[PDB]
Design a protein around this ligand. Structure first.
Ligand SMILES: CC[C@H](N)C(=O)N[C@@H]1C(=O)N2[C@@H](CC[C@@H]1CO)CC[C@H]2C(=O)NC(c1ccccc1)c1ccccc1
Ligand SMILES: CC[C@H](N)C(=O)N[C@@H]1C(=O)N2[C@@H](CC[C@@H]1CO)CC[C@H]2C(=O)NC(c1ccccc1)c1ccccc1
Ligand SMILES: CC[C@H](N)C(=O)N[C@@H]1C(=O)N2[C@@H](CC[C@@H]1CO)CC[C@H]2C(=O)NC(c1ccccc1)c1ccccc1
Ligand SMILES: CC[C@H](N)C(=O)N[C@@H]1C(=O)N2[C@@H](CC[C@@H]1CO)CC[C@H]2C(=O)NC(c1ccccc1)c1ccccc1
Ligand SMILES: [Zn+2]
Ligand SMILES: [Zn+2]
Lengths: 100, 101
């Protein structure tokens, strides 16, 4: 805090290379853009800036949404997407949750 | 189209009307949120949607109230975005569910 926790993967171009073998439903450019790079096992990816790791992407799911869902403290996220967006995902999620 | 009252379409004119304000709610915020005071009581009104607001309690934030009551306002939207507005209206919704339960 507060610099990239993986400065080697800072450049989007760098991150996109790491997806050579990529074969999963979720779009690699999205992931790359969202901050993530592939780890080299299953569908596991990790954010370049906060170092958060996601896994088991379902077919509809959006990179930017999960990033905010799971690691909403990421400063890359905040810079690229702003605070109110983050508040949004959680709110939506919390409301649905309560509605069951 | 959508302007509404271009005579109060700027901060300085808006804050003037508070040259005599007495109530809890801050005078510089109301202004930034697009409101001028009328004259009667604590009655205040937006400039771009003509939203009226009165009975300001001691905990209510102008922008929240602008979105709670007049969410369509094109000025609001172009100050705080779809997200902020919806976030105000998704959370009163949450409150209700949380006290059903
Ligand atoms: C960012 C990598 C860093 N090494 C780290 O903290 N990883 C984890 C982490 O941030 N989270 C994982 C939990 C164990 C780790 C704590 O060291 C799960 C996701 C995240 C986390 O704790 N998320 C919380 C949360 C909630 C509000 C603000 C910030 C974080 C969380 C909990 C439930 C649902 C969504 C988010
Ligand atoms: C990304 C969409 C997917 N459907 C999803 O919601 N994934 C979540 C997820 O990856 N994590 C959340 C757990 C519920 C989900 C499991 O599907 C919390 C964080 C992450 C996770 O399971 N593992 C992380 C991690 C981080 C810190 C401690 C333990 C686990 C992780 C870390 C490195 C590499 C891969 C995952
Ligand atoms: C701008 C002044 C002051 N910080 C405030 O009242 N902010 C609002 C706020 O926190 N929330 C309102 C939206 C307008 C502001 C967001 O910047 C409604 C949602 C609320 C909020 O507390 N969101 C939380 C949250 C916590 C639990 C469940 C769901 C949502 C939030 C969640 C994750 C990460 C950061 C905040
Ligand atoms: C933000 C102040 C206070 N907490 C509040 O929200 N009051 C409400 C309110 O002003 N309005 C909401 C109605 C419930 C409240 C009445 O106590 C809907 C929109 C607004 C409104 O209709 N204001 C009127 C008004 C006039 C007299 C009595 C009550 C409401 C209004 C119309 C034009 C100019 C000023 C106020
Ligand atoms: Zn991140
Ligand atoms: Zn308005």
């Amino acid at each position: 805090t507060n610099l990239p926790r993986n400065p080697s993967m800072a450049d989007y171009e760098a991150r996109i290379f790491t997806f050579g073998t990529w074969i999963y439903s979720v779009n690699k450019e999205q992931l790359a853009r969202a901050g993530f790079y592939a780890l080299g096992e299953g569908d596991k990816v990790k954010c370049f800036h906060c170092g958060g790791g996601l896994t088991d992407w379902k077919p509809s799911e959006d990179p930017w949404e999960q990033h905010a869902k799971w690691y909403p403290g990421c400063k890359y996220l905040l810079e690229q997407k702003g605070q109110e967006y983050i508040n949004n995902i959680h709110l939506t999620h919390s409301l649905e949750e309560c509605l069951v």
